[PDB]
Short mmCIF file of C-alpha atoms in Angstrom, two decimals:
data_model
loop_
_atom_site.label_atom_id
_atom_site.label_comp_id
_atom_site.label_asym_id
_atom_site.label_seq_id
_atom_site.Cartn_x
_atom_site.Cartn_y
_atom_site.Cartn_z
CA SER A 1 47.43 99.20 232.63
CA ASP A 2 45.93 102.22 230.87
CA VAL A 3 49.36 103.79 230.33
CA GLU A 4 50.78 100.69 228.63
CA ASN A 5 47.60 100.44 226.55
CA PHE A 6 47.88 104.07 225.43
CA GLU A 7 51.57 103.59 224.59
CA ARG A 8 50.75 100.50 222.52
CA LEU A 9 47.93 102.33 220.73
CA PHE A 10 50.17 105.29 219.89
CA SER A 11 52.58 102.75 218.43
CA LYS A 12 49.64 101.40 216.42
CA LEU A 13 48.79 104.90 215.16
CA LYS A 14 52.42 105.37 214.10
CA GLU A 15 52.17 102.04 212.27
CA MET A 16 49.07 103.31 210.47
CA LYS A 17 50.77 106.61 209.63
CA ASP A 18 53.74 104.76 208.13
CA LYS A 19 51.47 102.47 206.10
CA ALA A 20 49.71 105.57 204.76
CA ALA A 21 53.07 107.07 203.77
CA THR A 22 53.94 103.82 201.95
CA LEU A 23 50.77 104.01 199.84
CA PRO A 24 52.04 106.03 196.81
CA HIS A 25 55.11 103.79 196.45
CA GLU A 26 52.82 100.78 196.81
CA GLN A 27 50.44 102.00 194.10
CA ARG A 28 53.33 102.55 191.68
CA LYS A 29 54.54 99.02 192.41
CA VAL A 30 51.05 97.64 191.74
CA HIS A 31 50.92 99.43 188.38
CA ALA A 32 54.29 98.00 187.35
CA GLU A 33 53.13 94.51 188.35
CA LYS A 34 49.90 94.93 186.37
CA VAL A 35 51.99 95.85 183.33
CA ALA A 36 54.19 92.80 183.93
CA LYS A 37 51.16 90.51 184.18
CA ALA A 38 49.75 91.88 180.91
CA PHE A 39 53.05 91.20 179.14
CA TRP A 40 53.34 87.79 180.82
CA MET A 41 49.92 86.74 179.51
CA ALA A 42 50.57 88.25 176.07
CA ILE A 43 53.65 86.11 175.39
CA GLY A 44 51.81 83.00 176.55
CA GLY A 45 53.27 82.67 180.04
CA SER B 1 77.39 87.19 173.20
CA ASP B 2 74.70 84.53 172.79
CA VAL B 3 74.87 83.20 176.36
CA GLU B 4 74.88 86.71 177.86
CA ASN B 5 71.67 87.64 176.02
CA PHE B 6 69.99 84.47 177.29
CA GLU B 7 71.24 85.25 180.81
CA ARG B 8 69.73 88.74 180.63
CA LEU B 9 66.42 87.69 179.07
CA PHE B 10 66.01 84.69 181.39
CA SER B 11 66.28 86.98 184.41
CA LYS B 12 63.92 89.51 182.81
CA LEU B 13 61.40 86.71 182.28
CA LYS B 14 61.89 85.64 185.91
CA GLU B 15 61.49 89.24 187.12
CA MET B 16 58.33 89.62 185.03
CA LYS B 17 57.04 86.29 186.36
CA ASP B 18 57.74 87.38 189.94
CA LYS B 19 56.04 90.77 189.51
CA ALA B 20 52.99 89.11 187.96
CA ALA B 21 52.81 86.54 190.76
CA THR B 22 53.11 89.20 193.49
CA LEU B 23 50.22 91.30 192.11
CA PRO B 24 47.43 89.79 194.30
CA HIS B 25 49.52 90.14 197.47
CA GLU B 26 50.47 93.73 196.62
CA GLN B 27 46.83 94.60 195.90
CA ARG B 28 45.95 93.37 199.40
CA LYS B 29 48.74 95.51 200.88
CA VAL B 30 47.44 98.57 199.02
CA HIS B 31 43.94 97.94 200.37
CA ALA B 32 45.21 97.53 203.93
CA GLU B 33 47.28 100.71 203.61
CA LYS B 34 44.24 102.59 202.29
CA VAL B 35 42.24 101.41 205.32
CA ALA B 36 45.07 102.49 207.62
CA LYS B 37 45.25 105.88 205.91
CA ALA B 38 41.50 106.52 206.20
CA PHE B 39 41.52 105.74 209.92
CA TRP B 40 44.74 107.67 210.56
CA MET B 41 43.37 110.75 208.78
CA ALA B 42 40.09 110.55 210.70
CA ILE B 43 41.75 110.10 214.11
CA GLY B 44 45.01 112.06 213.98
CA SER C 1 57.98 72.93 185.36
CA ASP C 2 59.11 76.55 185.69
CA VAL C 3 62.42 75.83 183.95
CA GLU C 4 60.76 74.27 180.89
CA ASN C 5 58.29 77.17 180.83
CA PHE C 6 61.09 79.75 180.93
CA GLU C 7 62.97 77.90 178.18
CA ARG C 8 59.85 77.84 176.01
CA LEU C 9 59.22 81.54 176.63
CA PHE C 10 62.80 82.46 175.72
CA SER C 11 62.23 80.52 172.51
CA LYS C 12 59.08 82.62 172.04
CA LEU C 13 61.05 85.84 172.57
CA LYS C 14 63.59 84.69 169.98
CA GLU C 15 60.67 84.03 167.62
CA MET C 16 59.44 87.58 168.21
CA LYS C 17 62.93 89.00 167.68
CA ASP C 18 63.23 87.16 164.36
CA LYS C 19 59.79 88.35 163.22
CA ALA C 20 60.86 91.92 164.05
CA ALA C 21 64.02 91.46 161.97
CA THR C 22 61.88 90.20 159.07
CA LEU C 23 59.75 93.36 159.12
CA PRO C 24 61.72 95.60 156.68
CA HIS C 25 61.94 92.81 154.09
CA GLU C 26 58.22 92.17 154.63
CA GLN C 27 57.31 95.83 154.11
CA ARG C 28 59.27 95.96 150.84
CA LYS C 29 57.44 92.83 149.69
CA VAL C 30 54.09 94.42 150.56
CA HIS C 31 54.95 97.52 148.52
CA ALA C 32 55.89 95.41 145.50
CA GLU C 33 52.62 93.48 145.81
CA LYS C 34 50.63 96.72 146.06
CA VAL C 35 52.30 97.89 142.84
CA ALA C 36 51.46 94.55 141.22
CA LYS C 37 47.81 94.81 142.29
CA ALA C 38 47.56 98.33 140.86
CA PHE C 39 48.92 97.14 137.51
CA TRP C 40 46.72 94.03 137.63
CA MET C 41 43.58 96.14 138.06
CA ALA C 42 44.72 98.69 135.47
CA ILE C 43 44.97 96.14 132.65
CA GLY C 44 41.58 94.72 133.56
CA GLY C 45 42.68 91.62 135.46
CA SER D 1 60.67 84.65 118.81
CA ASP D 2 56.88 84.90 119.07
CA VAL D 3 56.41 81.92 121.39
CA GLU D 4 59.27 83.02 123.67
CA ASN D 5 57.71 86.46 124.18
CA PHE D 6 54.38 84.84 125.08
CA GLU D 7 56.19 82.48 127.46
CA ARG D 8 57.87 85.43 129.19
CA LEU D 9 54.77 87.63 129.37
CA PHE D 10 52.51 84.77 130.48
CA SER D 11 54.79 84.12 133.46
CA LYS D 12 55.01 87.84 134.21
CA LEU D 13 51.21 87.99 134.24
CA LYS D 14 51.16 84.94 136.52
CA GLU D 15 53.79 86.49 138.81
CA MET D 16 51.81 89.74 138.92
CA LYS D 17 48.62 87.77 139.62
CA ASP D 18 50.34 85.86 142.43
CA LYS D 19 51.77 89.01 144.03
CA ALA D 20 48.38 90.72 143.89
CA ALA D 21 46.65 87.68 145.41
CA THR D 22 49.20 87.40 148.24
CA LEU D 23 48.78 91.05 149.31
CA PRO D 24 46.13 90.46 152.04
CA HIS D 25 48.11 87.58 153.57
CA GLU D 26 51.34 89.60 153.51
CA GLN D 27 49.60 92.57 155.12
CA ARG D 28 48.53 90.28 157.97
CA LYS D 29 52.12 89.04 158.36
CA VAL D 30 53.39 92.63 158.51
CA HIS D 31 50.84 93.45 161.22
CA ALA D 32 51.78 90.37 163.25
CA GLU D 33 55.48 91.21 162.90
CA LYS D 34 54.81 94.78 164.04
CA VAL D 35 53.01 93.43 167.11
CA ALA D 36 55.91 91.06 167.79
CA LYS D 37 58.40 93.92 167.40
CA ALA D 38 56.53 96.23 169.79
CA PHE D 39 56.40 93.55 172.49
CA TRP D 40 60.00 92.46 171.91
CA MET D 41 61.25 96.04 172.18
CA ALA D 42 59.25 96.64 175.36
CA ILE D 43 60.38 93.41 177.05
CA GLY D 44 63.94 92.76 175.84
#
């Protein structure tokens, strides 16, 4: 029904809000992994 | 200790290998989170 | 395999460590050779 | 002894010639060792 659909979509919006809050931590993790890949290639990995 | 240094460096090589291997997956997560943020900011 | 690759890369890190330990002796040798080149040019070599 | 002095000075000229000629190669070794040290310190 429309109520269950709205409840599910609010849950989806909360999911999107939480993903957005994760973004700065995720971007720092990506930078650290880029550094690791550069070192990994440099030593001949 | 010789063996302890190898133990430490082996795990640091493994950690560096794992970070490097996870980079494409993490880049896809960052993109998906950016899409989620843009839609959340526009809607909410 | 991944084990042989890790073993080879540890060997590479030990190579880099040994090169780093050689650096002070190498810099003293470079200074002595710079002195020698200055004298060599001075006497018309 | 006249010949002994020439023997000594000839080899000192040769040693000085050899040091001077090795300078560019040794400078490249120093640079490579500095690169190895920077990466070893950052990783290990």
